[PDB]
Design a protein around this ligand. Structure first.
Ligand SMILES: *[C@@H]1O[C@H](CO)[C@@H](O[C@@H]2O[C@H](CO)[C@@H](O[C@@H]3O[C@H](CO[C@H]4O[C@H](CO)[C@@H](O)[C@H](O)[C@@H]4O)[C@@H](O)[C@H](O[C@H]4O[C@H](CO)[C@@H](O)[C@H](O)[C@@H]4O)[C@@H]3O)[C@H](O)[C@H]2NC(C)=O)[C@H](O)[C@H]1NC(C)=O
Ligand SMILES: *[C@@H]1O[C@H](CO)[C@@H](O[C@@H]2O[C@H](CO)[C@@H](O[C@@H]3O[C@H](CO)[C@@H](O)[C@H](O)[C@@H]3O)[C@H](O)[C@H]2NC(C)=O)[C@H](O)[C@H]1NC(C)=O
Ligand code: NAG
Ligand code: NAG
Ligand code: NAG
Ligand code: CU
Ligand code: CU
Ligand code: CU
Ligand code: CU
Ligand code: NA
Ligand code: NA
Length: 499
């Protein structure tokens, strides 16, 4: 683990996480990037050093720290042309922010075009020395982080616009494609008799994964970065960019057990050990498990998750009982996605820079028809009705700058204004279920914040809008460092081929 103060050097390098060799974007020499860690209250100073040379995978870059509120530091959030211009090749940029009021499991990733798909992504943990769940496990360290990622043999800019799934699922950086089922698999070690806090992080660009471990049940204690009541399950469907902490009690016989992460599409199932890793008890021989999957009889359902501490839902407990209700109507024309009639196209001047330069109203802010001006210190309700007009469902939506209440989940026709889970990425479900996923949050974080489908190819296709929150205070609340004001002139001075 590096951090809370660290250099992250970005380069292009050859890698072969499933035995097939390809060029990729790597962080400190590896993909996924190394674990970044600290404790609640730390100040993070992550110096991002751009040494990229390969334009096909972009030579510029920009990093988002997924799940952090960034109160007072909206400039450090990451999304290109929303919160900054990209870092240019051969330059560095110091992201300097504090985490006074959050702890949990997070991650970081490029937030420039579809660059994270090519490798720029890794996990990020903020420990709490008074964690209220600390008494449920014995081990929680670098070796208890489990990442999942889709891997493609053809680069993001060189394959289809909307890929039909990945060549391999990788678990802690390794996995098999059907074309080579002898490639080395990841091993996660446990000691019989000890209890583990496993921190499961989806680094996926697209597929969701159905996650299970042969012979073991899992106790969910954290949802994205929110502590939950303990929920016992035997499988977990996890969508792109989501996180869960689960406790596993290593109390079965000393042996090798299959860890499984089945994608919703691409190469599904497990023939030859695809979509698998190995849980190995100390003592067991270094071989593959021969265990069998049994039918999940206790799968995670989101409506069953509730926060550990009572947290009132924003607003009054009835439909539209808030200061501002926004409905997101989806459309798609074969190459581009739309939200209320507008497909997102990044502006020339970053949204934050427009605001600092005086723009405060929906009328003044660009791009027109994609920026929503929200009142300050108010309750907001957003609904995302599922429709056949938007193929590639279920779309997992992410709100920057905020954790939100899920008042209505996918696969449920009920509204819960009493005790639903809060999180930061939510499946919007499917038209076959008649879904109308609905969320609420309060606006106490002045800044423009991205709201978008976390399937990166959908994002590249324009499936996004901007929440411009409390625009009269943005300038006063987020002072910016000189190195930030210098990003756009350096970036805009570049030759196109050096982007
Ligand atoms: C997914 O979920 C969303 C979010 O709820 C639904 O959209 C809301 O849907 C209902 C349509 O039934 C809308 O409700 C109606 O609102 C009228 C007033 O709307 C205006 O003002 C409100 C409040 O300022 C604004 O939100 C809105 O933009 C309008 O400008 C009321 O007049 C209606 O009351 C009349 O009809 C009702 C219902 O039958 C009667 O009970 C009343 O007595 C009255 O005569 C009604 O409440 C609401 O405006 C929508 N919200 C939006 C767009 O934010 C989606 O429809 C749902 N989609 C799917 C596929 O399920
Ligand atoms: C910069 O990064 C890109 C993207 O990873 C690298 O592209 C790689 O480009 C090569 C050369 O064209 C591709 O190989 C070719 O594939 C085609 C199509 O199947 C085949 O017909 C050719 O005969 C050849 O094998 C390669 O697949 C591609 N890699 C990926 C992941 O898409 C490029 O090499 C990098 N540039 C440098 C200088 O390293
Ligand atoms: C896990 O849960 C199932 C279903 O509740 C239960 O019957 C089973 O014995 C548990 N498995 C283990 C290994 O405890
Ligand atoms: C889809 O919409 C976009 C954005 O309006 C437009 O530029 C593109 O040409 C359209 N594509 C098709 C296939 O119509
Ligand atoms: C608004 O701000 C007040 C004052 O600090 C706070 O107590 C309250 O929870 C907030 N209400 C909303 C709707 O954000
Ligand atoms: Cu993210
Ligand atoms: Cu985010
Ligand atoms: Cu999507
Ligand atoms: Cu984002
Ligand atoms: Na937390
Ligand atoms: Na068997």
């Amino acid at each position: 683990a590096v951090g809370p103060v660290a250099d992250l050097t970005i380069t292009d390098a050859a890698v072969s996480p499933d035995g097939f060799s390809r060029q990729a974007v790597v962080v400190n020499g590896v993909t996924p990037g190394p674990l970044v860690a600290g404790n609640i209250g730390d100040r993070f100073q992550l110096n991002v050093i751009d040494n990229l040379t390969n334009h096909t995978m972009l030579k510029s870059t920009s990093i988002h720290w997924h799940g952090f509120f960034q109160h007072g530091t909206n400039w450090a959030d990451g999304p290109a042309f929303i919160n900054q211009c990209p870092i240019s090749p051969g330059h560095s940029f110091l992201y300097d922010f504090q985490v006074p009021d959050q702890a949990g499991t997070f991650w970081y990733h490029s937030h420039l075009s579809t660059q994270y798909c090519d490798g720029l992504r890794g996990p990020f943990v903020v420990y709490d020395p008074n964690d209220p769940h600390a008494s449920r496990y014995d081990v929680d360290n670098d070796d208890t982080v489990i990442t999942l990622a889709d891997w493609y043999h053809t680069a993001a800019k060189l394959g289809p616009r909307f890929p039909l799934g990945a060549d391999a699922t990788l678990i802690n950086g390794k996995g098999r494609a059907p074309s080579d089922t002898t490639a080395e698999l990841s091993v996660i070690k446990v000691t019989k008799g000890k209890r583990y806090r496993f921190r499961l992080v989806s680094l996926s660009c697209d597929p969701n994964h159905t996650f299970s471990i042969d012979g073991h049940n899992l106790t969910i204690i954290e949802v994205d970065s929110v502590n939950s009541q303990p929920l016992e399950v035997d499988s977990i469907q996890i969508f792109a960019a989501q996180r869960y902490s689960f406790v596993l009690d290593a109390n079965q016989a000393v042996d090798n057990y299959w860890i499984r992460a089945n994608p919703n599409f691409g190469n599904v199932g497990f023939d030859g050990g695809i979509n698998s890793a190995i849980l190995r008890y100390d003592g067991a021989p270094a071989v593959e498990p021969t265990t069998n999957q049994t039918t999940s009889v206790k799968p995670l359902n989101e409506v069953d998750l509730h926060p550990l501490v009572s947290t009132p839902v924003p607003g009054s407990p009835s439909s539209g009982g808030v200061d501002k209700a926004i409905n997101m109507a989806f459309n798609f024309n074969g190459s581009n996605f739309f939200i209320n009639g507008a497909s997102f196209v990044p502006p020339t001047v970053p949204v934050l820079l427009q605001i600092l330069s005086g723009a405060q109203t929906a009328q003044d802010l660009l791009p027109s028809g994609s920026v929503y001006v929200l009142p300050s210190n108010a309750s907001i309700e957003i609904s995302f009705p599922a429709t056949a007009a938007a193929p590639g469902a279920p779309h997992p939506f992410h709100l920057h700058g905020h954790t939100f209440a899920v008042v209505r989940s996918a696969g449920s026709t009920v509204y819960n204004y009493d005790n639903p889970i809060f999180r930061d990425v939510v499946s919007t479900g499917t038209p076959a279920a008649g879904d109308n996923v609905t969320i609420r949050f309060d606006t106490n974080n002045p800044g423009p914040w991205f709201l978008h489908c976390h399937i990166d190819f959908h994002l590249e296709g324009g499936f996004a809008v901007v929440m411009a929150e409390d625009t009269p205070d943005v300038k006063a609340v987020n002072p910016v460092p000189q190195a930030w004001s210098d990003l756009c002139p350096t970036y805009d001075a570049l030759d196109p081929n050096d982007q």
